[PDB]
Amino acid sequence: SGAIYVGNYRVVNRHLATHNDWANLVWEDSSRDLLVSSTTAQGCDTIARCDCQTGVYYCSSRRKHYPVSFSKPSLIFVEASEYYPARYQSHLMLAVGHSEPGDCGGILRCQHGVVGIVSTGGNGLVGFADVRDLLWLDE
Ligand SMILES: COc1ccccc1S(=O)(=O)N1CCC[C@H](C(N)=O)C1
Ligand SMILES: [Zn+2]
């Protein structure tokens, strides 16, 4: 679990969005595993606007943060799960690291701010849904 709170927006994994997220929907993209809902309170986070390929992510299944080198956002094949059929997930960045299903929502950050959230895992890999291209989150 986990979310990004920026301005009057809440960013979560689309497969973990609640009834309340869907009732206050701003934007969603099944191919990216992202959903953004509106909030009444002002958020605690800042979004990175950069091309960093290193950062640190929070891993709930280890209660620890890990430093990672990750690929640029791209179209990557992801196997079928309880939440999605087998498909290509877009705007995904892979890194070598630990990730279990419940780790989705952990934040990846660089020195500039929030880069994205955990969205995929297994096999000693961790995949993050990028949010740096969503410029409207800042206004
Ligand atoms: C071992 O599998 C994981 C580990 C960490 C995280 C996720 C998995 S998952 O592949 O089960 N996963 C389930 C949730 C939706 C996700 C997606 N983005 O398509 C896929
Ligand atoms: Zn950066």
XYZ file of C-alpha atoms and ligand atoms in Angstrom:
160
model
C 0.000 0.000 0.000
C 0.936 3.688 -0.367
C 0.060 6.967 -2.084
C 1.588 10.290 -3.220
C -0.154 13.438 -1.931
C 0.605 16.506 -4.058
C -1.545 19.660 -4.030
C -5.197 18.576 -4.108
C -4.354 15.174 -5.654
C -3.812 11.627 -4.335
C -1.834 9.245 -6.650
C -2.319 5.497 -6.026
C -1.837 2.154 -7.882
C -5.022 1.781 -9.989
C -5.456 -1.860 -8.751
C -5.476 -0.639 -5.102
C -7.813 2.399 -5.595
C -10.663 2.505 -3.040
C -14.426 3.261 -3.570
C -13.570 6.847 -2.443
C -10.761 7.219 -5.031
C -13.184 6.199 -7.822
C -15.926 8.579 -6.528
C -13.410 11.500 -6.671
C -11.671 10.360 -9.914
C -9.510 12.899 -11.811
C -7.637 10.533 -14.208
C -6.786 6.835 -14.568
C -4.763 4.698 -16.983
C -5.043 0.877 -16.766
C -1.938 0.484 -19.020
C 0.127 2.440 -16.427
C -1.504 0.977 -13.245
C -2.143 4.606 -12.047
C -5.172 6.421 -10.688
C -5.370 10.025 -9.435
C -8.237 11.229 -7.194
C -8.999 14.680 -5.699
C -8.519 15.583 -2.015
C -9.776 18.408 0.235
C -6.528 18.715 2.268
C -3.249 20.006 0.736
C -0.709 17.220 0.136
C 2.674 16.588 1.780
C 4.750 15.654 -1.388
C 6.811 17.357 -4.286
C 7.183 15.638 -7.803
C 10.634 15.313 -9.434
C 10.934 16.882 -12.939
C 14.187 15.281 -14.093
C 15.839 12.348 -15.922
C 17.461 10.693 -12.833
C 18.056 6.936 -13.185
C 19.142 6.377 -9.514
C 17.122 6.898 -6.320
C 15.840 5.233 -3.160
C 12.549 3.324 -2.669
C 10.608 2.168 0.404
C 10.094 -1.647 0.638
C 7.250 -2.416 3.132
C 7.989 -6.186 3.114
C 11.453 -5.420 4.597
C 10.553 -2.167 6.537
C 13.615 -0.660 4.772
C 14.634 1.793 2.061
C 16.947 0.547 -0.711
C 19.076 2.479 -3.239
C 18.383 1.436 -6.906
C 19.571 2.019 -10.494
C 16.461 1.857 -12.750
C 15.647 1.843 -16.461
C 14.024 4.799 -18.308
C 10.170 4.677 -18.473
C 9.172 2.113 -21.105
C 6.626 -0.495 -22.393
C 7.323 -3.775 -20.526
C 5.472 -7.103 -20.694
C 3.804 -8.018 -17.360
C 2.276 -11.457 -16.703
C -1.404 -11.958 -15.772
C -2.298 -11.444 -12.098
C -5.575 -11.357 -10.084
C -5.804 -7.634 -11.068
C -4.963 -7.579 -14.777
C -4.818 -9.856 -17.807
C -1.328 -10.419 -19.349
C -0.411 -7.108 -21.063
C 2.263 -4.460 -21.804
C 2.462 -1.907 -18.980
C 3.608 1.529 -20.186
C 5.737 4.188 -18.380
C 7.343 1.415 -16.221
C 10.924 1.494 -14.862
C 12.690 -1.726 -13.713
C 15.417 -2.178 -11.152
C 17.062 -5.068 -9.316
C 15.528 -5.226 -5.827
C 12.988 -6.915 -3.553
C 9.228 -6.432 -4.215
C 6.199 -8.504 -3.061
C 2.569 -7.685 -4.133
C 1.846 -5.724 -0.881
C 4.887 -3.510 -1.625
C 2.886 -1.668 -4.371
C 2.572 2.002 -3.447
C 6.059 2.360 -1.935
C 7.584 5.629 -3.133
C 10.747 5.897 -5.277
C 12.519 9.275 -4.757
C 15.597 11.011 -6.127
C 17.239 14.301 -4.862
C 14.532 16.260 -6.819
C 11.433 14.667 -5.290
C 9.014 11.816 -5.981
C 9.800 9.789 -9.130
C 7.117 7.062 -8.973
C 5.545 4.186 -7.024
C 6.169 0.408 -6.829
C 3.817 -1.359 -9.286
C 5.502 -4.735 -10.235
C 7.873 -7.321 -8.691
C 9.120 -10.902 -8.346
C 12.293 -12.671 -9.564
C 14.516 -10.207 -7.708
C 13.156 -7.263 -9.781
C 11.069 -4.239 -8.758
C 9.064 -2.140 -11.267
C 7.993 1.474 -10.655
C 5.183 3.394 -12.360
C 6.702 6.778 -13.391
C 4.821 9.989 -12.480
C 7.418 12.638 -13.661
C 5.677 13.217 -17.007
C 2.337 14.173 -15.295
C 3.012 17.930 -15.237
C -0.570 18.833 -14.315
C -0.016 17.289 -10.821
C 1.884 20.601 -9.982
C -0.984 22.956 -10.868
C 5.304 -11.353 -7.314
O 4.442 -10.414 -7.971
C 4.482 -9.104 -7.566
C 5.434 -8.565 -6.716
C 5.409 -7.211 -6.418
C 4.426 -6.395 -6.930
C 3.457 -6.914 -7.770
C 3.492 -8.264 -8.093
S 2.252 -8.904 -9.182
O 2.875 -9.258 -10.420
O 1.493 -9.877 -8.457
N 1.255 -7.655 -9.491
C -0.052 -7.655 -8.807
C -0.606 -6.248 -8.755
C -0.643 -5.631 -10.152
C 0.746 -5.646 -10.800
C 0.723 -4.937 -12.144
N 1.205 -3.702 -12.162
O 0.268 -5.491 -13.147
C 1.219 -7.105 -10.862
Zn 15.889 13.570 -10.033
